[PDB]
Structures are given as structure tokens and as C-alpha cells.
């Protein structure tokens, strides 16, 4: 999955194979290689340092210095350390009879695409989604979600220019009651950078609509920095979970591996292609396996 990191890790481990017992010196050399692989993958410096302290402690706790096949102990502890950095176990959204979600984040992060993906995901699970196109600034934004809605077979309500947050609410709540739409997915405005006025508008919108979940959508190819906006969003709006997009173009994985530490939020979904089908519920253990070469 994260080819640069994946190859560096597997290499550092494969270097130990078939050489018998290792000394403490050998073990420290491998931990350094692991640390550099994480630093070059743009992993948060604190996450990387904790990762390797955890690999050390765990591997010594399994008597790696007495193992005749220490590569296998290192492989297992690296797996476990990847899993826990990614969040340990899956924490997926629990839906109720009526649900309203926001997708928030910077322009270009994958919000509109992710909205349509979620509508498709849940449509197939028996839900009746409604996309709400509430981004009025982005050129053709409403037409874009309108078209994606046609593609996935899901209705799209478009907010009008200047519409107030209470008018949006009434119109969305009306459309969802009349048509029995039990998952409302709201695609929101966003710029290339944190914009304070616009954050104010978003906060006001959140207060009025009262979403059950607020998904912060993050382009995984910007690495660590993708995560710099997380506190800003959370302090103003109240983020409940993350979507990490464009993992299919991400060679490093720094944002994914750093997300839990930096943001304290669970990863809900991964975006793995530009198609509406390109959406995976997020399981730390699957990605952990994938990074070390599984599948
Ligand atoms: N390859 C890939 N492309 C994606 C993914 N998610 C979104 N995109 C693409 O990223 C770009 C931005 O998508 P968009 O939904 O408009 O982002 P937005 O400005 O935050 O709404 C578009 O070219 C999408 O096709 C993903 O998981 N993988
Ligand atoms: Cl060295
Ligand atoms: Mg958009
Ligand atoms: Mg909730």
C-alpha cells in the first residue's frame, strides 16, 4: 500500500533473515533503519519515536536476543506497532434510524467525492441517503455533486446562493421526511487554507443542523501537514472521525500513521481510488498487514 515505506520496512526485516541470533548492537541498527524509514515517510517525529520504542520493548519482551530467527519476531512486532499507530481496532460509525453527517476539510481534500462514495456505500446497505450540496463557492460544486448523485442513484438537494443555515435545515429536514431519507450527507464549503470567516459560517451551520457525525476529509498525499488543520476544525466545529483519501497515490503513509496521535480522532474510512466504489471501512489491522506486504 505505501510502497516506499513498505519496501524499506520489509527490507530492514529481510536483512536479518537466515543469519541466526542477533546482538544488541544488531538490534539497535535495525531500530535505527526503521526509524529512518518512518522519518522519510513523513511520519510525525513523536509518533516515529514512540513506534520504535514500542518495537524495542515488545521485541525484548519476546526474547528477540535469544531467538534463532529474530527477523520473525521483528516482523510481528512491527506489524503490531503499525496496527496500534493506525488505531488498534476499527471504530466505525454506528448509524441510528435518522442520521445527518457533515464532510468538512480543505478544498481539494476529497469531500465531494467522498460524499458520493458514502451515499453509494450506505445505499447498498439498505439506507436511503440524501446528498446535500452546501458548497456554494466552488465553481460548479452543486453541478458536480448533482452529477455524482445521478451516477450512484441518490437524490441531491442543492443549497441556493446566500441561503441561511435555518433555511437549509428546514428544506433538508422536509425533503428527508417526505422522501424517507435516513442518511443525510452534507458536502460543505472549503478553501485551500483555513479561512476564519468561512470556519465561522461552518460552525454556525453545524450548530443549526446538529450533525451526528462530522467527518474531516484529509488528502493523505500532503503527509503530516494534512493533519495541521485538524485542531482548527475540531475546536470550531467538533470533528468525530476522519476520512483519509488518495491512499492509492500515497507512497509514504505519514498522514495515516500519524493521524491518531496528532488528532486523537478515529479513522472511519480510506479513499482508495477516484471511483464511487473507491471506499474502504478502516481497519487498522488490514492496513498494517498491507504495509508489510500482505495481498
Ligand atoms: N485517486 C483518488 N482520487 C480521489 C480520491 N478522492 C477524491 N479524489 C479526486 O481528488 C480530486 C478532488 O476531489 P473533490 O471530491 O472534488 O475534493 P473537494 O474539492 O474536497 O470536494 C478529484 O480529482 C477527485 O477525483 C481517492 O481516494 N483517490
Ligand atoms: Cl547508523
Ligand atoms: Mg467539493
Ligand atoms: Mg455522534
CSV table of C-alpha atoms and ligand atoms in Angstrom, one decimal:
chain,number,residue,atom,x,y,z
A,1,UNK,CA,0.0,0.0,0.0
A,2,UNK,CA,2.5,2.7,1.0
A,3,UNK,CA,5.3,1.4,-1.4
A,4,UNK,CA,8.3,3.5,-0.2
A,5,UNK,CA,7.7,2.7,3.5
A,6,UNK,CA,6.5,-0.9,2.7
A,7,UNK,CA,9.7,-1.7,0.8
A,8,UNK,CA,12.0,0.0,3.5
A,9,UNK,CA,10.4,-1.9,6.4
A,10,UNK,CA,10.4,-5.2,4.6
A,11,UNK,CA,14.0,-4.7,3.6
A,12,UNK,CA,15.2,-3.9,7.1
A,13,UNK,CA,13.5,-7.1,8.3
A,14,UNK,CA,14.7,-9.3,5.4
A,15,UNK,CA,18.3,-8.2,6.2
A,16,UNK,CA,18.1,-10.2,9.5
A,17,UNK,CA,16.7,-13.4,7.9
A,18,UNK,CA,18.8,-16.5,7.8
A,19,UNK,CA,21.6,-15.0,9.9
A,20,UNK,CA,20.8,-16.6,13.3
A,21,UNK,CA,20.9,-14.8,16.6
A,22,UNK,CA,21.5,-11.0,16.7
A,23,UNK,CA,23.4,-9.0,19.2
A,24,UNK,CA,22.0,-5.9,21.0
A,25,UNK,CA,24.1,-3.8,18.6
A,26,UNK,CA,22.4,-5.5,15.5
A,27,UNK,CA,19.0,-4.9,17.1
A,28,UNK,CA,19.7,-1.1,17.6
A,29,UNK,CA,20.9,-0.9,13.9
A,30,UNK,CA,17.6,-2.3,12.8
A,31,UNK,CA,15.6,0.0,15.0
A,32,UNK,CA,17.5,3.0,13.5
A,33,UNK,CA,16.7,1.7,10.0
A,34,UNK,CA,13.0,1.5,11.0
A,35,UNK,CA,13.1,5.0,12.5
A,36,UNK,CA,14.7,6.4,9.3
A,37,UNK,CA,12.1,4.7,7.1
A,38,UNK,CA,9.3,6.3,9.2
A,39,UNK,CA,11.0,9.8,9.1
A,40,UNK,CA,11.4,9.5,5.3
A,41,UNK,CA,7.7,8.5,5.1
A,42,UNK,CA,6.8,11.9,6.7
A,43,UNK,CA,5.6,10.3,9.9
A,44,UNK,CA,5.2,12.7,12.8
A,45,UNK,CA,8.5,12.8,14.7
A,46,UNK,CA,6.9,11.9,18.0
A,47,UNK,CA,4.9,9.0,16.5
A,48,UNK,CA,8.0,7.6,14.9
A,49,UNK,CA,10.0,7.8,18.1
A,50,UNK,CA,7.2,6.1,20.1
A,51,UNK,CA,6.8,3.5,17.3
A,52,UNK,CA,10.4,2.3,17.6
A,53,UNK,CA,10.4,2.5,21.5
A,54,UNK,CA,7.4,0.2,21.3
A,55,UNK,CA,9.0,-2.2,18.7
A,56,UNK,CA,12.1,-2.3,21.1
A,57,UNK,CA,10.2,-3.0,24.3
A,58,UNK,CA,7.9,-5.6,22.7
A,59,UNK,CA,10.7,-7.4,20.9
A,60,UNK,CA,12.8,-7.7,24.0
A,61,UNK,CA,9.7,-8.8,25.9
A,62,UNK,CA,9.6,-11.7,23.4
A,63,UNK,CA,13.3,-12.5,24.0
A,64,UNK,CA,14.4,-11.4,20.5
A,65,UNK,CA,18.1,-11.5,21.5
A,66,UNK,CA,17.7,-15.3,22.3
A,67,UNK,CA,15.7,-16.1,19.1
A,68,UNK,CA,17.3,-18.1,16.3
A,69,UNK,CA,15.0,-16.3,13.8
A,70,UNK,CA,14.8,-12.7,15.1
A,71,UNK,CA,13.5,-11.4,11.8
A,72,UNK,CA,10.2,-13.1,12.6
A,73,UNK,CA,10.0,-11.5,16.0
A,74,UNK,CA,10.8,-8.1,14.4
A,75,UNK,CA,8.2,-8.6,11.7
A,76,UNK,CA,5.5,-9.5,14.2
A,77,UNK,CA,6.3,-6.5,16.5
A,78,UNK,CA,6.5,-4.1,13.6
A,79,UNK,CA,3.0,-5.3,12.5
A,80,UNK,CA,1.6,-4.8,16.0
A,81,UNK,CA,3.1,-1.4,16.2
A,82,UNK,CA,1.7,-0.3,12.8
A,83,UNK,CA,-1.8,-1.6,13.9
A,84,UNK,CA,-1.8,0.4,17.1
A,85,UNK,CA,-0.5,3.6,15.4
A,86,UNK,CA,-3.4,3.3,13.0
A,87,UNK,CA,-5.8,3.0,15.9
A,88,UNK,CA,-5.7,-0.5,17.3
A,89,UNK,CA,-9.1,-1.8,16.2
A,90,UNK,CA,-11.8,-0.5,13.9
A,91,UNK,CA,-14.1,2.2,15.3
A,92,UNK,CA,-16.8,2.6,12.6
A,93,UNK,CA,-19.8,4.9,12.8
A,94,UNK,CA,-22.9,3.5,14.4
A,95,UNK,CA,-26.0,4.6,12.5
A,96,UNK,CA,-29.4,5.1,14.0
A,97,UNK,CA,-32.8,5.5,12.3
A,98,UNK,CA,-32.1,9.1,11.2
A,99,UNK,CA,-28.6,10.3,10.6
A,100,UNK,CA,-27.0,13.6,9.4
A,101,UNK,CA,-23.3,13.8,8.6
A,102,UNK,CA,-21.1,16.7,7.6
A,103,UNK,CA,-18.0,16.3,5.3
A,104,UNK,CA,-15.6,19.1,6.1
A,105,UNK,CA,-12.0,19.9,5.2
A,106,UNK,CA,-9.9,21.9,2.8
A,107,UNK,CA,-10.7,22.3,-0.9
A,108,UNK,CA,-9.1,19.6,-2.9
A,109,UNK,CA,-9.1,17.1,0.0
A,110,UNK,CA,-11.8,14.8,-1.5
A,111,UNK,CA,-15.0,15.9,0.2
A,112,UNK,CA,-17.4,15.9,-2.8
A,113,UNK,CA,-16.2,12.6,-4.0
A,114,UNK,CA,-16.2,11.1,-0.5
A,115,UNK,CA,-19.9,12.3,0.0
A,116,UNK,CA,-20.9,10.4,-3.2
A,117,UNK,CA,-18.9,7.3,-2.1
A,118,UNK,CA,-20.6,7.3,1.3
A,119,UNK,CA,-24.0,7.6,-0.4
A,120,UNK,CA,-23.2,4.6,-2.5
A,121,UNK,CA,-21.7,2.6,0.4
A,122,UNK,CA,-24.8,3.1,2.5
A,123,UNK,CA,-27.4,2.8,-0.3
A,124,UNK,CA,-26.1,-0.8,-0.8
A,125,UNK,CA,-26.5,-1.5,2.9
A,126,UNK,CA,-30.3,-0.6,2.8
A,127,UNK,CA,-30.1,3.1,3.6
A,128,UNK,CA,-31.8,5.8,1.7
A,129,UNK,CA,-29.2,8.6,1.5
A,130,UNK,CA,-29.6,12.2,0.6
A,131,UNK,CA,-26.7,14.3,-0.6
A,132,UNK,CA,-26.8,18.0,0.3
A,133,UNK,CA,-24.7,20.2,-1.9
A,134,UNK,CA,-24.0,23.1,0.5
A,135,UNK,CA,-20.8,24.4,-1.1
A,136,UNK,CA,-21.9,27.5,-3.0
A,137,UNK,CA,-18.5,28.9,-3.7
A,138,UNK,CA,-16.6,26.1,-5.5
A,139,UNK,CA,-17.1,26.5,-9.3
A,140,UNK,CA,-19.8,24.1,-10.4
A,141,UNK,CA,-19.7,22.4,-6.9
A,142,UNK,CA,-23.5,21.8,-6.9
A,143,UNK,CA,-23.5,20.6,-10.5
A,144,UNK,CA,-20.6,18.3,-9.6
A,145,UNK,CA,-22.5,16.6,-6.7
A,146,UNK,CA,-25.6,16.7,-8.8
A,147,UNK,CA,-23.9,14.6,-11.4
A,148,UNK,CA,-22.3,12.2,-8.9
A,149,UNK,CA,-25.7,11.8,-7.3
A,150,UNK,CA,-27.1,10.7,-10.7
A,151,UNK,CA,-24.3,8.2,-11.0
A,152,UNK,CA,-24.9,6.5,-7.7
A,153,UNK,CA,-28.7,6.8,-7.8
A,154,UNK,CA,-29.1,9.1,-4.9
A,155,UNK,CA,-31.1,12.4,-4.7
A,156,UNK,CA,-29.2,15.7,-4.3
A,157,UNK,CA,-30.7,18.8,-2.7
A,158,UNK,CA,-28.7,21.9,-3.7
A,159,UNK,CA,-28.5,25.0,-1.4
A,160,UNK,CA,-29.3,28.3,-3.2
A,161,UNK,CA,-26.9,31.3,-3.1
A,162,UNK,CA,-27.0,33.2,0.2
A,163,UNK,CA,-29.3,30.7,1.8
A,164,UNK,CA,-29.2,30.9,5.7
A,165,UNK,CA,-28.4,27.9,7.8
A,166,UNK,CA,-32.0,27.7,9.2
A,167,UNK,CA,-33.5,27.7,5.7
A,168,UNK,CA,-31.1,24.9,4.7
A,169,UNK,CA,-32.2,23.0,7.7
A,170,UNK,CA,-35.9,23.3,7.1
A,171,UNK,CA,-35.5,22.3,3.4
A,172,UNK,CA,-33.3,19.3,4.2
A,173,UNK,CA,-35.5,18.1,7.1
A,174,UNK,CA,-38.6,18.4,4.9
A,175,UNK,CA,-37.0,16.6,1.9
A,176,UNK,CA,-35.8,13.8,4.2
A,177,UNK,CA,-39.2,13.3,5.9
A,178,UNK,CA,-41.3,13.3,2.8
A,179,UNK,CA,-38.9,11.0,0.9
A,180,UNK,CA,-37.9,8.8,3.9
A,181,UNK,CA,-34.1,9.6,3.6
A,182,UNK,CA,-32.4,8.2,6.6
A,183,UNK,CA,-28.8,9.3,5.9
A,184,UNK,CA,-28.1,12.9,5.1
A,185,UNK,CA,-24.7,13.7,3.8
A,186,UNK,CA,-23.7,17.4,3.7
A,187,UNK,CA,-20.9,18.5,1.4
A,188,UNK,CA,-19.6,21.8,2.7
A,189,UNK,CA,-17.5,24.7,1.6
A,190,UNK,CA,-13.8,24.9,1.9
A,191,UNK,CA,-10.7,26.8,0.7
A,192,UNK,CA,-7.1,25.9,0.1
A,193,UNK,CA,-6.2,27.1,3.5
A,194,UNK,CA,-8.0,27.6,6.9
A,195,UNK,CA,-10.2,30.7,6.4
A,196,UNK,CA,-11.6,32.2,9.6
A,197,UNK,CA,-14.8,33.8,8.2
A,198,UNK,CA,-15.6,30.5,6.5
A,199,UNK,CA,-14.9,28.5,9.6
A,200,UNK,CA,-17.4,30.8,11.3
A,201,UNK,CA,-20.0,30.0,8.7
A,202,UNK,CA,-19.3,26.3,9.0
A,203,UNK,CA,-19.6,26.4,12.9
A,204,UNK,CA,-22.9,28.3,12.6
A,205,UNK,CA,-24.1,25.7,10.0
A,206,UNK,CA,-23.1,22.8,12.4
A,207,UNK,CA,-24.9,24.4,15.3
A,208,UNK,CA,-28.1,24.7,13.3
A,209,UNK,CA,-28.1,21.3,11.6
A,210,UNK,CA,-26.8,19.3,14.5
A,211,UNK,CA,-25.0,16.5,12.7
A,212,UNK,CA,-24.5,13.2,14.4
A,213,UNK,CA,-21.0,12.9,12.7
A,214,UNK,CA,-18.6,15.4,11.3
A,215,UNK,CA,-16.0,13.7,9.0
A,216,UNK,CA,-12.8,15.6,8.5
A,217,UNK,CA,-11.6,14.6,5.0
A,218,UNK,CA,-7.8,14.6,4.6
A,219,UNK,CA,-5.6,14.2,1.5
A,220,UNK,CA,-3.1,11.6,2.5
A,221,UNK,CA,-0.5,12.7,0.0
A,222,UNK,CA,0.2,16.0,1.8
A,223,UNK,CA,1.5,13.9,4.6
A,224,UNK,CA,1.8,15.2,8.2
A,225,UNK,CA,0.7,18.7,7.1
A,226,UNK,CA,-2.7,17.3,6.1
A,227,UNK,CA,-3.2,17.0,9.8
A,228,UNK,CA,-2.3,20.6,10.7
A,229,UNK,CA,-5.9,21.7,10.1
A,230,UNK,CA,-7.4,19.1,12.4
A,231,UNK,CA,-7.4,21.2,15.6
A,232,UNK,CA,-8.8,24.2,13.9
A,233,UNK,CA,-11.7,22.2,12.5
A,234,UNK,CA,-12.3,20.3,15.8
A,235,UNK,CA,-12.1,23.4,18.1
A,236,UNK,CA,-14.7,25.3,15.8
A,237,UNK,CA,-16.9,22.5,14.6
A,238,UNK,CA,-16.5,19.3,16.6
A,239,UNK,CA,-14.9,16.6,14.4
A,240,UNK,CA,-16.0,12.9,15.2
A,241,UNK,CA,-13.9,11.0,12.7
A,242,UNK,CA,-11.5,11.1,9.7
A,243,UNK,CA,-11.5,10.1,6.1
A,244,UNK,CA,-8.1,9.6,4.6
A,245,UNK,CA,-8.3,10.0,0.8
A,246,UNK,CA,-5.9,9.2,-2.1
A,247,UNK,CA,-4.1,6.4,-0.3
A,248,UNK,CA,-3.7,4.9,-3.7
A,249,UNK,CA,-1.4,7.7,-4.7
A,250,UNK,CA,0.3,7.8,-1.3
A,251,UNK,CA,3.8,6.2,-1.3
A,252,UNK,CA,4.7,7.1,2.3
A,253,UNK,CA,1.7,6.9,4.6
A,254,UNK,CA,2.8,9.6,7.0
A,255,UNK,CA,-0.6,11.2,7.5
A,256,UNK,CA,-2.3,7.8,8.1
A,257,UNK,CA,0.2,6.6,10.6
A,258,UNK,CA,0.3,10.0,12.4
A,259,UNK,CA,-3.4,10.7,12.5
A,260,UNK,CA,-4.4,9.1,15.8
A,261,UNK,CA,-1.6,10.8,17.8
A,262,UNK,CA,-2.0,14.2,16.3
A,263,UNK,CA,-5.7,14.4,16.0
A,264,UNK,CA,-7.0,11.9,18.7
A,265,UNK,CA,-9.9,11.1,16.2
A,266,UNK,CA,-10.7,7.6,14.8
A,267,UNK,CA,-10.2,6.9,11.1
A,268,UNK,CA,-13.6,5.9,9.7
A,269,UNK,CA,-12.9,5.3,6.0
A,270,UNK,CA,-10.0,5.2,3.5
A,271,UNK,CA,-10.3,6.6,-0.1
A,272,UNK,CA,-8.5,4.2,-2.4
A,273,UNK,CA,-9.4,5.4,-5.9
A,274,UNK,CA,-11.3,8.2,-7.7
A,275,UNK,CA,-14.3,5.9,-8.4
A,276,UNK,CA,-17.5,6.0,-6.3
A,277,UNK,CA,-16.6,2.4,-5.3
A,278,UNK,CA,-13.2,3.6,-4.1
A,279,UNK,CA,-14.1,3.5,-0.4
A,280,UNK,CA,-13.0,1.1,2.4
A,281,UNK,CA,-14.1,1.0,6.0
A,282,UNK,CA,-11.0,1.5,8.0
A,283,UNK,CA,-9.4,-1.5,9.8
A,284,UNK,CA,-6.0,-0.8,11.3
A,285,UNK,CA,-5.0,-4.5,11.1
A,286,UNK,CA,-5.8,-4.7,7.4
A,287,UNK,CA,-3.7,-1.7,6.5
A,288,UNK,CA,-0.9,-2.8,8.9
A,289,UNK,CA,-0.9,-6.2,7.0
A,290,UNK,CA,-0.9,-4.4,3.7
A,291,UNK,CA,2.0,-2.2,4.5
A,292,UNK,CA,4.1,-5.2,5.4
A,293,UNK,CA,3.2,-6.9,2.0
A,294,UNK,CA,0.0,-8.8,2.6
A,295,UNK,CA,-2.1,-9.1,-0.5
B,1,LIG,N1,-7.2,8.8,-6.7
B,1,LIG,C1,-8.1,9.3,-5.8
B,1,LIG,N2,-8.6,10.4,-6.2
B,1,LIG,C2,-9.5,11.0,-5.4
B,1,LIG,C3,-9.9,10.3,-4.1
B,1,LIG,N3,-10.8,11.0,-3.5
B,1,LIG,C4,-11.0,12.1,-4.3
B,1,LIG,N4,-10.2,12.1,-5.4
B,1,LIG,C5,-10.0,13.0,-6.5
B,1,LIG,O1,-9.5,14.2,-5.9
B,1,LIG,C6,-9.9,15.4,-6.5
B,1,LIG,C7,-10.7,16.3,-5.5
B,1,LIG,O2,-12.0,15.7,-5.3
B,1,LIG,P1,-13.2,16.5,-4.6
B,1,LIG,O3,-14.4,15.4,-4.2
B,1,LIG,O4,-13.7,17.5,-5.6
B,1,LIG,O5,-12.4,17.3,-3.5
B,1,LIG,P2,-13.0,18.5,-2.8
B,1,LIG,O6,-12.6,19.9,-3.5
B,1,LIG,O7,-12.5,18.5,-1.2
B,1,LIG,O8,-14.6,18.4,-2.9
B,1,LIG,C8,-10.7,14.9,-7.7
B,1,LIG,O9,-9.9,14.9,-8.8
B,1,LIG,C9,-11.2,13.5,-7.3
B,1,LIG,O10,-11.5,12.7,-8.4
B,1,LIG,C10,-9.2,9.0,-3.8
B,1,LIG,O11,-9.5,8.3,-2.8
B,1,LIG,N5,-8.3,8.6,-4.7
B,2,LIG,CL1,23.6,4.0,11.9
B,3,LIG,MG1,-16.1,19.7,-3.3
B,4,LIG,MG1,-22.4,11.3,17.2
